[PDB]
Amino acid sequence: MPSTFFNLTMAFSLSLLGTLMFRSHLMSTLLCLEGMVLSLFIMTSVTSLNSNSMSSMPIPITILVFAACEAAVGLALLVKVSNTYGTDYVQNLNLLQ
Amino acid sequence: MNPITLAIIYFTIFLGPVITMSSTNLMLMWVGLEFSLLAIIPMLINKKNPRSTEAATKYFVTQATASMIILLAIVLNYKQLGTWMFQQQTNGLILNMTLMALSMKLGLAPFHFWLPEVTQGIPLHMGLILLTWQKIAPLSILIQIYPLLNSTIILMLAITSIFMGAWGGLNQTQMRKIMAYSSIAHMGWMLAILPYNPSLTLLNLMIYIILTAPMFMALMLNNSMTINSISLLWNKTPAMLTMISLMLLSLGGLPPLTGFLPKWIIITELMKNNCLIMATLMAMMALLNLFFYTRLIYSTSLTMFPTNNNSKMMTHQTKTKPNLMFSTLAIMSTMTLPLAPQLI
Amino acid sequence: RYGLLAAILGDKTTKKLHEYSRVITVDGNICSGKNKLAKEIAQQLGMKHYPEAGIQYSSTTTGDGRPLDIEFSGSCSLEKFYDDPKSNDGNSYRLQSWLYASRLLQYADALEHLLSTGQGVVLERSIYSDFVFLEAMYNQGYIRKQCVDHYNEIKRLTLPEYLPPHAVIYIDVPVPEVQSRIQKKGDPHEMKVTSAYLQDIENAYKKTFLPKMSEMCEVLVYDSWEAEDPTKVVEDIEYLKYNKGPWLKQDDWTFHYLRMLVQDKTEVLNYTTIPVYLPEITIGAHQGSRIYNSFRELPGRKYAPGYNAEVGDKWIWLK
Amino acid sequence: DGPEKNYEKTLAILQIESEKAELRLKEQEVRRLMRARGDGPWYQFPTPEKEFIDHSPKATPDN
Amino acid sequence: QWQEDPEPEDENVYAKNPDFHGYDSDPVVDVWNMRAVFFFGFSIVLVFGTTFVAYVPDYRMQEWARREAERLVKYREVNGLPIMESNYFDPSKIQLPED
Amino acid sequence: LDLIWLEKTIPKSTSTLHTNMTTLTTNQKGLIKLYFMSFLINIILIIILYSINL
Amino acid sequence: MLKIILPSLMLLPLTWLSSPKKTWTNVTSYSFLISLTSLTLLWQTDENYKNFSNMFSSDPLSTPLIILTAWLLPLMLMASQNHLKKDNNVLQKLYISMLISLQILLIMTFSATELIMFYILFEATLIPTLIIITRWGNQTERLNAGIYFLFYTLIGSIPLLIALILIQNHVGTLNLMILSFTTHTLDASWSNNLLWLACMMAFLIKMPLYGVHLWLPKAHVEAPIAGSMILAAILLKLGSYGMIRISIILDPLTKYMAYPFILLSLWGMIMTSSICLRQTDLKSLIAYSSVSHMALVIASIMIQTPWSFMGATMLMIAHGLTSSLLFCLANSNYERIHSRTMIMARGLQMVFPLMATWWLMASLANLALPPSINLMGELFITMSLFSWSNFTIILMGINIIITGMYSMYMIITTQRGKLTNHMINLQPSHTRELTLMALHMIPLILLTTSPKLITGLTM
Amino acid sequence: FYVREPVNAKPNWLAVGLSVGASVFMWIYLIQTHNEDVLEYKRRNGL
Amino acid sequence: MMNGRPGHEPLKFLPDEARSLPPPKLNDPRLVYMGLLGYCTGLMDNMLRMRPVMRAGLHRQLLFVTSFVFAGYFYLKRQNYLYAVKDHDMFGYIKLHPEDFPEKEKKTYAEILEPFHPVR
Amino acid sequence: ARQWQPDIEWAEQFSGAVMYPSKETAHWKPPPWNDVDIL
Amino acid sequence: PFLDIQKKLGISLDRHFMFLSAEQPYKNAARCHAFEKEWIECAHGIGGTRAK
Ligand SMILES: CCCCCCCCCCCCCCCCCC(=O)OC[C@H](COP(=O)(O)OCCN)OC(=O)CCCCCCCCCCCCCCCCC
Ligand SMILES: Nc1ncnc2c1ncn2[C@@H]1O[C@H](COP(=O)(O)OP(=O)(O)O)[C@@H](O)[C@H]1O
C-alpha cells in the first residue's frame, strides 16, 4: 500500500486529467469519470481491508451505489444530447455562449 | 410531471442539502452532495429545449467531477487518520482539494464558467434553486471545516470571484446571467470571511438569499430574461418598479439599505484580522457591481423605455399576483439596516 | 383557483371529456358566411360559439366588457385598414398584431372552457388561420418584410404551446364571389377591399392553411352551398374520427399544465409583448405612459377586480 | 433647563462611550488570545467523541 | 416612425386665472397656497425666528467674557499681578522630563 | 485641461480600462473542453501554491 | 434633536396621505415651522457642545447648517411646484418625499456624533439625489450625469469606510467627542500618509477639488432646480463638514500632506473662476462659480488656522444661500426661455423689473461686496492664506478680479442690453418665483447683521 | 360589474378568521410571555 | 466562535439561562421598528397586487404588523442572550487569564510630553 | 419641453447578447426569447 | 455539525462509526485501536487548538 496506494492515486489523477480535457465524444468523459470511481472504490476497500476496519466496509459499496445512479443520470443526459444533435460530440454543446 | 415524481425529486433536492448539514461523517456529507446533483438534473430539463440539454450536461459534468474530487479527499483522509472526517492533523493538500472541489460546486472564481451558462438555459424558477438552495449544501461543508482551510487560497478565490463576477456582469444583458454573475461575486465575499469568522458567512448568505429570491420572482412576475424586457416593467406592473430599484442597489453595497451590512461587517472583520490589503481591493471592485446594477436601474425605473401596443392588451387582463413572499422578503431585505446589531 | 392541488384531487380534464368536447375553427375569406355556419355547428353539437376576435375581443372579455376607446384598445382600425392601405402610421400592421393578440386571448379562453367545462368550442378563425391576412398584406404593399418577420416571431414563440384545432371546417367561396358579397353589404370601407387582397387571402388558405393543418388535424372544406346547410356539415363533424393530431398524447397530467397556462392570460400573451422594437408596434414612452394612466384610471380598473369601489365593489377592507 | 443639564448629560454620554470603547478593544485582545491559546470557551474546535470508543472486551487480546 | 405624442405646449396660465400666483392652476388652491406660504414663510419664521435668535442670551459666552475680563483686569491690575501671565498651566504642575 | 485632459485621464480612462477587461474575460467560446481545461490549469496552480508554500 | 427629525419624518406620511390638490401647501407650510423648531438649537448660552443624546449632537459647526438644511426643504418644494406640476399625482408625491428625505438624512448627517453614522447617512444622500437628477432630469445626458455623481462619490467613499473602521480598531470608538479628547497622533509613516488621503479624499471629492470637480458641472446642468439647489447649498457642504470633524484625528500629517491639495485648490480657484468667464450655459457658469468658491474652502480647512475655519463656516453657509439664489433665478429664466443659453434672453430688466433686483443682489453676494457675510468669509480665508505664505494673495488675488468679472457678466448679458426681439413672449413673474428668491436673500440680509451665529467652531 | 365575476367579489371568510384569529392568538401568547418572562427574570435574579 | 462553548445547547433557540436576562420591553424601539417594517410589507403587498393600498386587507395588515412583532420579541430575546453570553465569556477570560490583560497605568498629562507641532 | 424619455435608439444598444460588443463577440446574436432554438 | 439535528433528536445514525475504535462487528478489534483511544480520550474537553 505505501506504493500500491500511489499507483491507485495517480490512476485517479490520470483519470482526473482525462475528465478535464475533453475531446469529441462525451461518452469518453463519462467513461473516464467512472475510472475514478473504480480507483476510489479500490483505494477505500484497500485501506479499510488493511486497517481491519470492518465498520467501514459499508462505505466502499455506498460509494458504488451512489456512483452508479450518478452515472445513470449522466448517460440519460448523453442519450438526450444525441437525440437533439445526433451525436454526443461536445462541440455541439455551445449554445449557451 | 407526475405529481409523485415531483415529490420524489423535490424531496431529494431537499434531503440533499439537509443530510449534508446534519451529518458529521463526511461520507454522509458527500452523498448529501450527490443526492443534490441527481435531484437538480431532472428539473433543469423540464422544457427539454435544445438549450436545456446543454445546460444539464454541463452542470452534471462539472458537478460530477467535483463530487469525485471531494470523495477522493475523504478517501485520502481515511488513510491519514482512520477517521472519516477532517481533523487538525489533516495534510494541507487534503483540505485544499476540498476547497477547490467545493469551490467548483459552488462555482467560485476560476471555476465560474459553468454557472453563468447553466443559469442561462434554465427557467427563472429553477434558476433560483440552482443559485440559492444548492449553495447551502457545499457552504455547510466548508463552514464546518473552516478552522482547517487555507487563508491564502480562499482569499484568492474570493478576490478572483469578486472580479470575475463584476467584470462578467458589466457586459451581460441577459438577466439570468447578470444574476449568475452577481451570485459569483457575493459568493466570493462569503468565502473571504470563512477562515476568519464563519458566522458572517451565514449572514452574507442569508442576506443574499433574502435579496436574490425577491429579485428573481420579480424577473419572472413578467418572465423577462432581457433588460429591455424588464424595462417595460413600468407598463406591465408599475408598483414593483420602486422595490426592484432598491433591491438591486441593495444587492450592491450602497449604505442606507440592508445590503451594506454584509460588506460592512465582512470589511470590519477582515480589518480586525488585518487584511486591509485584500479587503480594500474587494470593496473597490464591489463598486463595479453597482455600476451594472444601476445601468439596469436606469432602463427599468429612472428612465421609461418605449413599449409595444400589444402591451396595452396585457394590462387589460388581471395580472396574476406576486406571492406574498415577495413583499416580506423585499422589505426585510431593502430595509432592515436599522436592526443590524441583532442580525450579526 | 385551479392548480396542482385541485388537479391532485380530481379536477382532471380527461375525466371531463366527451364525444363533442372538441375545437372546431371554421375559416373562410372576407365573407364566407362562416359565422352562420359556426353558430349552427356549435349549437347542433351543443358547443360554445366564440365570436370572431376583433380589435375589442379583450375589453369585452375584461372588466365592464364595454367597448374600450380606440387608443385604449391599441388604436387599431380595420376601417382605416381598407381606406388607407400602406399607411404612413401603419395602422394595418398594428391592426393585424392586435388581432393576433385578440385570437390568442380567444383561443386561450376557448381552451380554458374546453378543459374546465368539458364543452367543445367553435372559434371561427384562429391563430392558426391568421397568417393568411399577413401573407396577402406582404404580397401587397400593405406590410414590409420585417413587419412579416415580427409577426412570424410572435407566432413561433406563442402558437406551438397551445394544442392544434381538432378539425378545421372550411368554406371556399371564391374571390369573385366574395367581392360580390362584400359589395352587396353596406360597409363603406369593407367594400374598398382590393380584389387582389381577397385572392391572396384565399390562396394562403388553400396553398398554405388547409394542407398544413390537414396532416395535424381533420380538415372539412365545404363550398358555399354546403355551408348554408350546417346540418350537412354537422354530420361530417360527427363522422369525424379525430384519429390523427397531437391531441392524442394529452394525458391528464399533461393537460393540467396547459390548463394552468390558459388560466393565466398574462402569460398567454407574454410573448406578444416581446421587446422587439419595430416602429409600428412601439407605443412610445410619453404616449404609452399617458394611455396607461388613462386606461388604469377607468372605473373598476384602477384596482384589481373586486377591489375598486367605483363600480360597486364592497368588503375591500377585509378582502 | 440650564448649563448644568448638558454638561452632566455630555459627561454621561462620554462615560458610556469610553467604557464601550475599552471593552471593544479588550474583546479583540481576548479573541486573539483564545484563538491561538485555545484555552477559553471560544474557538474550541471539535475532536471525535469518546462516547463511541468501544472499550468492550474485544476478540483479540491486545485490542 | 414610431408612435409618440407631439411635444405639448406650455399654457399661459396667466390667460385664465389672471390673478395666478404661480402655485397651482385652479384659483382657490393658488390663493390658499400663497396665503399660507407668505405667512408661514415670512410672517412667522423671518419675524418670530429673528426675534428668538436675536434674544438668544450671551451666545457662546461672549457676553459673559467681557465682564469676567473686566473683573480679572480689575483684580489683576489692582493687586499688581500680570494681566495675562505668560504661562498658563503653572510650571510647578508640569513635571518636565528631567533629561 | 477641463473637458478632454481631465476627463480622458480620470473619468474616461477608468471607463475604458474596465470595458476592455470585460471584453477579454467574457469573450468565451462556450465549448466545454476549453472551459474545463481551465479547471485543469487551476488545479495545477493551486497544487503548486500549496507545494511551494508547503 | 428629534424634533428637527421626527416631525420631519412625519412629513412623508403627510405628502402621501394628503389630498392631491392640497399636498403642496400642507408640506411647504409644515416644514417652514419645522425650520422654526430647528432655530431652537441656536440657543447656546455656554461654549460646551449640546450633546442631545448618545447618537445625536449639535455643535457650533453643525447648527448653522441643520437650520439651512431645514430651511431649503420649504424652498425646494416651492421652486419645483412648476415643473413637477405636469406630473401624475404620484410622481409629485414621490418628488416631494425625495426632497423631504434629503434633509431628514442631511439633518442627521450634520447632527451625527459617530463618524460612520456620518458615512452611512453621508453616502445615503446620493440615493435621493440621484433619483431627483436622473428621474426628472430634462436633458438626454442625466443618465450620464447620474453615473458621474454616483461613481466619483462612491470610489472616494469605500476608502473612507476602510479608514474609519481602521481608526476604530486603532483607537476603539468612532465617537467624535472621544476621538477629540483622546490622543490620536498619526506618525508620519508612508502608510499614515495614505490614511490621511483615504479620510480626506472622499470629503474632497463631493467638495469639488480642481482635480475631481467635473462631476458637479455635469450634475447641476441636467439636474432639476430642486436637485441643483440641494447639491450646491447642502450636498457639497457635506464634504466640508466632514473635513472639519475628521481632521481632529490625523492631526500631524496635514501640516505637510496638505500642500498638494492647497496648490491644486488655489490654482484651481483661478482656472475654475476663469472658464466661468466664457461658458454659454448659465447653469454651467454658476456651477464653476461654485467650484471656485468651494476651492477656497478646501484651502482653509487645510491651512487650519482659527480664522480659516470660521472663514470657511461663514462662506459655506453664505455661498450656499447665494448659489441657490443664483440657481433658482437661472431656472426662472430657463422655464420661460426654454433654453439654458446665456446669450439669448438679453434685456430682461426691461421686462421683468424686480427679478433683476434679485439678480443684482445675488451677483453682489456672488462677488465680495463688503457689508455681506460672503465678503467677511473671503476676507478671512484670504488673511490666513496670506499667513501661510504672503505669495498666496497673488493667486487669491487673480480669483477676486475674475470673480468680479463673471458675476457682473451674468448680470450684464442676461439682465441688461436690448431686449430679445421675440422669444416666446415672456410671461410675467409669478409671486412664487419672487418669494423663492426673497426667502433666499432676506435670510442673507438678516445673517449679515449678526455674523457670530455662523462663525464656526474655532471662534 | 365584471363579465368574469371577480374571484374576490365576496371575502374568503376563512382567510379572515385564520388571519384575524391567528393574530389575536399571537398577542395573547406574546403579552403573556412578557409578563411571565418579567416575573421569572425578576425572581430569578434577586428582584 | 461562540459555538463549542461548554454546555452549548446543540439545537435550542434560547437556553433557559436566558431567563436570567431582562425581557425585551414590548415597545423597545426595535420591536416597534419591526412593527413598522411589517406594516410596510403589508402595504407593499397591497400595492404590488393592485389593491387600495391602505384600505384593503385590514385583516392582513394586522397579521403583518403582528407577525413581525411577534417574531421580534422572541428573536430579540435571543440575540440579547447571545450578546450577554459574549460578555460572560469575555469578562471571565479577562480574569482567568489576568496577566495577559494587565491594568496598565496611565500617567497624568503633566508627566507625559506630547510633541507640539505648530500650525503656523 | 418634456424630460427626454429614451427613444428607440437608446433602447437598441441594450439588445444583443453582450452590451459592449467585441470584435468577434458582436458576430453573435441575441438568445431566442422562447429559450428554444431553430437548429 | 452545521445543523445538529442528530444530537437534538438524540439519534446517532452517523456517529457510531467514524473512527477505527468504534464498535467493530463481532468485536473484532481494529488495528491501532490501542492508540486512537489514547488519542481521543486525551483530546476530549480540550479543543483542537490544544489537541494539536
Ligand atoms: C442660522 C444659521 C443659518 C441659517 C440660514 C437660513 C435661516 C432661515 C430661517 C431663519 C432666518 C432668521 C434666523 C437666522 C438669521 C438671524 C439674524 C438675526 O437674528 O439678526 C439679529 C439682529 C439683531 O442684531 P444682534 O443679534 O443683536 O447683533 C449682535 C450685536 N452685538 O436682528 C435684527 O436687527 C434684524 C434687522 C433686520 C433689518 C436689517 C437691516 C440692515 C441690513 C444690512 C444689509 C447690508 C448689505 C447686505 C448685502 C448683502 C449682499 C448684497
Ligand atoms: N388579420 C386580419 N387582417 C385584416 N383584416 C381582418 C383580419 N382578420 C379579420 N379581418 C377582417 O374582419 C372582417 C370580418 O370577418 P368575417 O367574419 O369574415 O366577415 P363577416 O363578419 O362579414 O362574415 C373581414 O372583412 C376581414 O377582412
Query: How far does residue G384's CA lie from ligand 1's centre (Å)?
Result: 26
Query: How far does residue G448's CA lie from ligand 1's centre (Å)?
Result: 5
Considering only residues 258 to 277 of chain G, which have any Cβ-Cβ distance to chain F shorter than 8 Å? 271, 275
Q: Tell if the CB–CB gap between F6 and G152 is shorter than 8 Å.
A: no
Give the C-alpha separation, B20 to B28, whole Å: 7
Give the C-alpha separation, E3 to E17, whole Å: 34
Widest pairwise Cα distance in chain F: 53
Q: Tell if the CB–CB gap between J15 and B231 is shorter than 8 Å.
A: no
Using N-to-C axis directions, what is the helix angle for G392-414 and G353-366, rounded to 10°? 170
In angstroms, what separates the C-alpha of G173 from chain D's closest C-alpha?
5
> Which residue is it, cell 400593405?
C142
Residues of G in contact with J3 (CB under 8 A): 136-138
Give the C-alpha separation, C267 to B224, whole Å: 11
Give the C-alpha separation, G236 to G319, whole Å: 11
Q: Residue C265 in contact with residue C274, Cβ under 8 Å?
A: no
Q: Tell if the CB–CB gap between C318 and I50 is shorter than 8 Å.
A: no
For residue B308, report the phi and psi dihedrals to the nearest 5 degrees.
-110, 150
Positive or negative torsion for Cα C13, C15, C16, C17: positive
Nearest residue on chain K to D48, judged by CA atoms? Answer: K40
CB-nearest partner of G148 from F1, F6, F11: F11
Q: Tell if the CB–CB gap between G271 and F7 is shorter than 8 Å.
A: no
Give the C-alpha separation, E53 to B269, whole Å: 47
Nearest residue on chain G to J6, judged by CA atoms? Answer: G140
Q: Ligand 2: which of C99, C142, C147, C172 to mutate, most ligand atoms within 8 Å of CB? A: C99
DSSP helix/strand/coil, E41: helix
Residues of G in contact with I120 (CB under 8 A): 387
Q: Tell if the CB–CB gap between I23 and H37 is shorter than 8 Å.
A: yes
Which amino acid appears at position B343 of this protein? Answer: L
Q: Residue G99 in contact with residue G73, Cβ under 8 Å?
A: yes
Cell numbers for D45: 474546535
Cell numbers for A21: 480535457
For residue C24, report the phi and psi dihedrals to the nearest 5 degrees.
-120, 115
Q: Do chains F and A touch (3 or more CB pairs under 8 A)?
A: yes
The residue extents of the domains of chain I are: 1-97
Residues of A in contact with F30 (CB under 8 A): 94-97
In angstroms, what separates the C-alpha of B12 from chain J's closest C-alpha?
27
Q: Which ranges in B222-308 belong to alpha helices (H)?
A: 227-231, 233-236, 239-251, 260-272, 278-297
Give the CA dihedral G114, G117, G121, G122, nearest 10 degrees. 60
Give strand pairing partners of C218. Answer: C167
Nearest residue on chain F to G151, judged by CA atoms? Answer: F11
Range of the domain at B259: 2-344
Question: What is the CATH number that goes with domain A2-97?
Answer: 1.10.287.3510
> Which residue is it, cell 418669494?
G435
CB-nearest partner of K31 from A51, A56, A58: A51
> Which residue is it, cell 476560476?
B110
Q: How many CA atoms lie within 13 A of G217 on its CB side?
A: 24
Cell numbers for C121: 368550442
In angstroms, what separates the C-alpha of E10 from chain J's closest C-alpha?
8
Say if residue G47 is exposed, middle or buried (CB neighbours under 10 Å; 0-12, 13-18, 19+).
middle
Residues of F in contact with B96 (CB under 8 A): 46-47, 50
Say if residue D61 is exposed, middle or buried (CB neighbours under 10 Å; 0-12, 13-18, 19+).
exposed
Ligand lying closest to the C-alpha of residue E54: 1
- What Cα–Cα distance (Å) separates residue G70 from each residue in G7, G35, G241, G331? 11, 5, 16, 22
Indicate which atom in ligand 1 lies nearest the CA of residue G67. 4
3-state secondary structure chain G: CCCCCHHHHCHHHHHHHCCCCCHHHHHHHHHHHHHHHHHHHHCCCCCCCECCCCCCCECCCCHHHHHHHHHHHHHHHHHCCCCCCCCCCCCHHHHHHHHHHHHHHHHHHHCCCEHHHHHHHHHHCHHHHHHHHHHHCCCCCHHHHHHHHHHHHHHHHHHHHHHHHHHHHHHCCCEHHHHHCCCCCCCCCCCHHHHHHHHHHHHHHHCCCCCCCCHHHHHHHHCCHHHHHHHHHHHHHHHHHHHHHHCCCCCCCHHHHCHHHHHHHHHHHHHHHHHHHCCCEHHHHHHHHHHHHHHCHHHCCCCCCHHHHHHHHHHHHHHHHHHHHHHHHHHHHHHHHCCCECCCCCCHHHCCHHHHHHHHHHHHHHCCCCCCHHHHHHHHHHHHHHHHCCCHHHHHHHHHHHHHHHHHHHHHHHCCCCCCCCCCCCCCCCHHHHHHHHHHHHHHHHHHHCHHHHCCCCC
Ligand lying closest to the C-alpha of residue G74: 1
How many domains are contained in chain B? 1
H-run or E-run covering C110: helix C91-116
CB-nearest partner of B31 from A36, A66, A96: A66
- The answer to whether residue H31 neighbours chain I at the CB level (below 8 Å) is yes
Nearest to B148, CA basis, from B94, B209, B189, B82: B94
Q: Do chains C and A touch (3 or more CB pairs under 8 A)?
A: no
Give the C-alpha separation, F45 to F38, whole Å: 11
Give the C-alpha separation, B98 to B100, whole Å: 6
The set of residues, in sequence order, having a beta carbon less than 8 Å from that of K11 and lying 6+ positions away, is none
The residue extents of the domains of chain A are: 2-97
H-run or E-run covering C24: strand C23-24
Q: Atom 6 in ligand 1: which residue has the minimum CA distance?
A: G68
Give the C-alpha separation, D56 to E8, whole Å: 95
Measured in Å, how far apart are chain J's first and last C-alpha atoms?
49
Give the C-alpha separation, G119 to B256, whole Å: 10
Q: Atom 12 in ligand 2: which residue has the minimum CA distance?
A: C30
> Which residue is it, cell 416651492?
G78
In angstroms, what separates the C-alpha of B314 from chain C's closest C-alpha?
6
The set of residues, in sequence order, having a beta carbon less than 8 Å from that of I32 and lying 6+ positions away, is none
Chains B, D: CB contacts within 8 A come to 8
How far out from the chain centre does Cα A33 lie?
3
CB-nearest partner of B147 from D28, D45, D48: D45
Which amino acid appears at position C178 of this protein? Answer: V
Using N-to-C axis directions, what is the helix angle for B278-297 and B151-171, rounded to 10°? 20
Residues of C in contact with I56 (CB under 8 A): 307, 316-317, 319
In angstroms, what separates the C-alpha of K34 from chain D's closest C-alpha?
6
H-run or E-run covering B183: helix B175-192
The set of residues, in sequence order, having a beta carbon less than 8 Å from that of B56 and lying 6+ positions away, is A77, A80, B41, B44, B45, B118
The set of residues, in sequence order, having a beta carbon less than 8 Å from that of G303 and lying 6+ positions away, is G258, G262, G384, G385, G387, G388
Residues of I in contact with K15 (CB under 8 A): none
CB-nearest partner of B83 from D43, D45, D48: D48
Q: Residue G28 in contact with residue G77, Cβ under 8 Å?
A: yes
Query: How far does residue E94's CA lie from ligand 2's centre (Å)?
Result: 106
Q: Tell if the CB–CB gap between B306 and J6 is shorter than 8 Å.
A: yes
Q: Tell if the CB–CB gap between J3 and G140 is shorter than 8 Å.
A: no
Give the C-alpha separation, A94 to A78, whole Å: 15
- The answer to whether residue I50 neighbours chain B at the CB level (below 8 Å) is yes
Query: How far does residue C185's CA lie from ligand 2's centre (Å)?
Result: 13
In angstroms, what separates the C-alpha of H27 from chain I's closest C-alpha?
7
- The answer to whether residue G145 neighbours chain B at the CB level (below 8 Å) is no
Q: Tell if the CB–CB gap between B254 and G155 is shorter than 8 Å.
A: no
Chains B, E: CB contacts within 8 A come to 3
Note the resolution in Å, 1 decimal. Answer: 4.2
Residues of D in contact with I89 (CB under 8 A): 40-42
- Please give the angle made by the CA atoms of G175, G179 and G183, to the nearest 5 degrees: 160
Residue to mutate among A1, A48, A50, A52, with most K CBs inside 10 A, is A52
Considering only residues 127 to 166 of chain B, which have any Cβ-Cβ distance to chain A shorter than 8 Å? none
For residue C170, report the phi and psi dihedrals to the nearest 5 degrees.
-135, 140
Q: Residue G290 in contact with residue G239, Cβ under 8 Å?
A: no
The coordinates were experimentally obtained by cryo-EM
H-run or E-run covering I45: helix I29-48
DSSP helix/strand/coil, B304: coil
- The answer to whether residue B162 neighbours chain F at the CB level (below 8 Å) is no
CB-nearest partner of H41 from I23, I69, I70: I23
Q: Tell if the CB–CB gap between J1 and G338 is shorter than 8 Å.
A: yes
Q: Residue A38 in contact with residue A5, Cβ under 8 Å?
A: no
Give the C-alpha separation, G69 to G76, whole Å: 10
In angstroms, what separates the C-alpha of B249 from chain G's closest C-alpha?
9
Give the C-alpha separation, G114 to G141, whole Å: 37
Give the C-alpha separation, K18 to B336, whole Å: 42
Which amino acid appears at position B118 of this protein? Answer: V
The residue extents of the domains of chain G are: 2-459
For residue G50, report the phi and psi dihedrals to the nearest 5 degrees.
-90, 100
